[PDB]
């Protein structure tokens, strides 16, 4: 079945274990379930009892200081839904100060409807980073998992659940040592799925038996009716506790059994709009026989007789007692400490109030942004007042920004006195505008509301500055805006110029934030312009910025500076924010020119784009050049030793700022004493231009030489071709072929003094430069005796000679050894000299 167990009321558990016996046959629990304060309890007697049939929990589940439980998986195996009609201090599930809780064991948490979860102060838990609240919850912001055993990574966390990527890591999400978290496929989120991923009928949640069935899942969404669940129940029945519908035969005796005032825990339930509500709201009054409530004659408001005159509002559980009420017969204090925000629920909880009798006081709040949750305030009575005879009291509100939009709002105060202090994001214009809607205009106390600290760290001005002249360069920028004076020109300290860069024009409004570091705006200070005492003046101020990167977007604005005084005047002025850009210039040098020698007519060369683009670059400038190869080597005898083979701050100094305002006003108070005494009233190289590439090959070029190849990157070209500097790299072809050795007729001439002169031909197109003819002559039985002849020796002789030879037959052979290597050998010729 859907909910086969019994409906079963809320209950508390304390000081023993025998009162958990009466959960024998329950499945749903209306209200809440508190297990609390068992100290004389062994860890043994938790391993024999369970509560397998408990499925639905309405409001909240609370565990605090129980000695002996290590996991809940042997108690609550099948609970799935936390409905959250009433909450517990913005939460719905709170585990606090456990002593034995090893592991949670809550492998069936499906949907936390309203509220949040929070576990603190448990030095025994683990696996808490393996839970993935964002799949169960509908919010993550008001969760709080701090100060547990998992503050230090020490208790294991090895566990077998798709290992989701909801964070920046591939964390696997499992509940305990033997369970891992079930996650639906994301095509159908809250409808509930099966093990095969085929998700169920749309009016189900969590586990199911068989999909696409509204009669055999575990828990629906809207209501329940007799093994089924429909979105709106048909009217043989009326809704009740926003999870069921039931006939009017059921609700009628609940009005009858405790219209006898024997317990104040009931309310006289009335039929209205097919609902079995405790109290129907204002403008309605109940009839006796029909048990409905008819439209009331005239206006009749549902008053809310507040106990002990004042009720502090700490959280949504404190605010839910005021739901439906509209006349507050006491006073009201809102106090939301810390946290994120509650302004999404205060509208739907107390946004229907009109009449407060006492005073409204806002103290110690931190994260309110506006009082607009109060929808319908118009009249504050003040039969009683706060001490000091006050009626409106705002104090220490770190982010309260706008009270109300006055164009669509009204507010009256019959009597009383208002009060303001320490509201650093609250303007002095709003409180004066608050007075002009108020019934009071000059009911003050002296000292009344503050004037110096109210919004001292958040700016407002009702004077604006327009720029006049902007000057663009690539490095500097000159700025000039309009002249301006307060009504007393001695009170002027200069200007503050805040500026920073931005990649786009989505620049936030400068809220006010400083650092020693560099994560926000930087600021320069300007001396005030000199007085002319002339309405047509040189006093257009200006300042020139220096260290700017070219072709960069910028945003600038300026601000005034007045001595704060007792007069509510001279508020100064704020210039509007604008956008300016530096000019373009020369580019930077390109990076990493890499060339590889693979072929003779393919010389590849690649590079990197430059560091500073200085705008969109347009093309590249390549150049190459051949060379005569270092003619100092032409006069070396290549037979001696040596042959060559080619290939900290100051953000604010506030005391000095207090010194700067002191001595400046010291000059102001000096002449004030002077005037009041002295005046008495009367009684070329081959090249190309390459575009859209990072590598380049050059063809049709000589074998074995160096080409110094340099490369520039460059911006736009045909007006004022301006490019960067280059960087030079040599380049060589592949090593040479057979042409380093020569073929020719090895002819000889015998002289009578036994000196044989050899005539041959040299290499014509050599390996750059032939350096040595390794000639060698060989007698029969004798080894290959090598001889030497230089470049200059062949050039003078046109041949070589050999001196002092025995008579016989010799085998003479030549090797053309160049500087890039040795060639082949010639033909070993047979010449014979006789006796």
């Amino acid at each position: 079945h859907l909910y086969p167990g019994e409906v079963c009321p809320g209950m508390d558990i304390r000081n023993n274990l025998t009162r958990l016996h009466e959960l024998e046959n329950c499945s749903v629990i209306e209200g809440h379930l508190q297990i609390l304060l068992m100290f004389k309890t062994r860890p043994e007697d938790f391993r024999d009892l369970s509560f397998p049939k408990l499925i639905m929990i309405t409001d909240y589940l609370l565990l605090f200081r129980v000695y002996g439980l290590e996991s809940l998986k042997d108690l609550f195996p099948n609970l799935t839904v936390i409905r959250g009609s009433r909450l517990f201090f913005n939460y719905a599930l709170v585990i606090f100060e456990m002593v034995h809780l090893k592991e949670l064991g809550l492998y069936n948490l499906m949907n936390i409807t309203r509220g949040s979860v929070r576990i603190e102060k448990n030095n025994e838990l683990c696996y808490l980073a393996t839970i993935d609240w964002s799949r169960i919850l509908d919010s993550v912001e008001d969760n709080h998992i701090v100060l547990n055993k998992d503050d230090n990574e020490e208790c294991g966390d090895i566990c077998p659940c798709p290992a989701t990527v909801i964070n920046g890591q591939f964390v696997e999400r499992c509940w305990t040592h033997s369970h891992c978290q079930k996650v639906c496929p994301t095509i159908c989120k809250s409808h509930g799925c099966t093990a095969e991923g085929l998700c169920c009928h749309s009016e189900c949640l969590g586990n199911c038996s068989q999909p696409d069935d509204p009669t055999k899942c575990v828990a629906c969404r809207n209501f329940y009716l007799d093994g089924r669940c429909v979105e709106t129940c048909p009217p043989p029945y009326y809704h009740f506790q926003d999870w069921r519908c039931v006939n009017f035969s059921f609700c009628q005796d609940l009005h009858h059994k405790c219209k006898n005032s024997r317990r104040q825990g009931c309310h006289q339930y009335v039929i209205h709009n097919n609902k079995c509500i405790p109290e129907c709201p204002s403008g309605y009054t109940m009839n006796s026989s029909n048990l409905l409530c008819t439209p009331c004659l005239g206006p009749c408001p549902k008053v809310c007789h507040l106990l002990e005159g004042e009720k502090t509002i700490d959280s949504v559980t404190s605010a839910q007692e005021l739901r439906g009420c509209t006349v507050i017969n006491g006073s009201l204090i809102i106090n939301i400490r810390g946290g994120n925000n509650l302004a999404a629920e205060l509208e739907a909880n107390l946004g229907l109030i009109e009449e407060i009798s006492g005073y409204l006081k806002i103290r110690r709040s931190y994260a309110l942004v506006s009082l607009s949750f109060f929808r319908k305030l118009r009249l504050i009575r003040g039969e009683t007042l706060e001490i000091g005879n006050y009626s409106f009291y705002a104090l220490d509100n770190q982010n309260l920004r706008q009270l109300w939009d006055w164009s669509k709002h009204n507010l009256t105060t019959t009597q009383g006195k208002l009060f303001f202090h320490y509201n650093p994001k609250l303007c002095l214009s709003e409180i004066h505008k608050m007075e002009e809607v108020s019934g009071t205009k000059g009911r003050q106390e002296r000292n009344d509301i503050a004037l110096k600290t109210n919004g001292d760290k958040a700016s407002c001005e009702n004077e604006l500055l327009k720029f006049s002249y902007i000057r663009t360069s690539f490095d500097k920028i000159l700025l000039r805006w309009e002249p301006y004076w307060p009504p007393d020109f001695r009170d002027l300290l200069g200007f503050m110029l805040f500026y920073k860069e931005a990649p786009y024009q989505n620049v936030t409004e400068f809220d006010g934030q400083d650092a020693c570091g560099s994560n926000s705006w930087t600021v320069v200070d300007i001396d005030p312009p000199l007085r002319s005492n002339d309405p047509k003046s040189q006093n257009h101020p200006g300042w020139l910025m220096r260290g700017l990167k070219p072709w960069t977007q910028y945003a600038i604005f300026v601000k005034t500076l007045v001595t704060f005084s007792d007069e509510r005047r001279t508020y100064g002025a704020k210039s509007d924010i604008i956008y300016v850009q530096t000019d373009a210039t020369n580019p930077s040098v390109p990076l990493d020119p890499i060339s590889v020698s693979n072929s003779s007519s393919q010389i590849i060369l690649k590079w990197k784009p430059p560091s500073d683009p200085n705008g969109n670059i347009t093309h590249y400038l390549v150049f190459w050049e051949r060379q005569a190869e270092d003619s100092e080597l032409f006069e070396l005898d290549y037979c001696l030793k040596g042959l060559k083979l080619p290939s900290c701050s100051c953000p604010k100094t506030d005391s000095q700022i207090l010194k700067e305002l002191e001595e400046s006003s010291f000059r102001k108070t000096f002449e004030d004493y002077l005037h009041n005494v002295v005046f008495v009233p009367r009684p070329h190289r081959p090249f190309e231009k390459v575009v859209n590439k990072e590598s380049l090959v050059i063809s049709g070029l000589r074998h074995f030489t160096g080409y110094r190849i340099e490369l520039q990157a460059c911006n736009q070209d045909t007006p004022e071709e301006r490019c960067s500097v280059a960087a030079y790299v040599s380049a060589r072809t592949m090593p040479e072929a057979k042409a380093d050795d020569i073929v020719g007729p090895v002819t000889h001439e015998i002289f009578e003094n036994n000196v044989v002169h050899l005539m041959w031909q040299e290499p014509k197109e050599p390996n750059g430069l032939i350096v040595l003819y390794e000639v060698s002559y060989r007698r029969y039985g004798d080894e290959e005796l090598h001889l030497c002849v230089s470049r200059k020796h062949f050039a003078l002789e046109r041949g070589c000679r050999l001196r002092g030879l025995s008579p016989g037959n010799y085998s003479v052979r030549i090797r053309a050894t160049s500087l890039a290597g040795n060639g082949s050998w010639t033909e070993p010729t047979y010449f014979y000299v006789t006796d």
Binding site: W485, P487, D488, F489, R490, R531, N533, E671, H675, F679, V680, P681, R682
Partner: peptide, 25 residues
């Protein structure tokens, strides 16, 4: 403005009364 304060008052008083002089006990 006509808030003749600071060095305006030493000039504009002479500008309206540059020949009678000022008054003294």
């Amino acid at each position: 403005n006509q808030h003749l304060c600071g060095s305006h008052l030493v000039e504009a008083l002479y500008l309206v009364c540059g020949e009678r002089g000022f008054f003294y006990t």
